[PDB]
Amino acid sequence: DRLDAALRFQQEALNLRAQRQEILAANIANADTPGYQARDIDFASELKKVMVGVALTLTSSHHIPAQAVVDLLYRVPDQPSLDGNTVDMDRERTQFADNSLKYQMGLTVLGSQLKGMMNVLQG
């Protein structure tokens, strides 16, 4: 559908921001686990990958339709801890706040596009 193509980029950006938000909050929650590595995703490359499948064929009514079913990069440690935990509070707190801001911005842009498509139709 053409409607999907217009809203594909912002939807994928919003979903990627939510996933990275979950990853950052997981990094915050597991700050005290000894031996836990701080993981993160490269937002731009994954957004390229998602932006850049074959529903199985249903011959009749009984035939069952096809059933549907990111890469994590390690953060470079800054300070060496003794328990092997590489999670840094300041870095991930700033990243968490930034991801929240960008999620809000994506919501704003997507809502503006939908509202414009709506006022085009209203009449």
């Binding site: 199985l56 064929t57 249903l58 011959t59 035939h63 096809a66 059933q67 079913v69």
Partner: peptide, 13 residues
């Protein structure tokens, strides 16, 4: 039997 079974679409995850 899988030997005499005729298939149109198959999804194997």
């Amino acid at each position: 039997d899988a030997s005499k079974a005729t298939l149109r679409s198959r999804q194997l995850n």
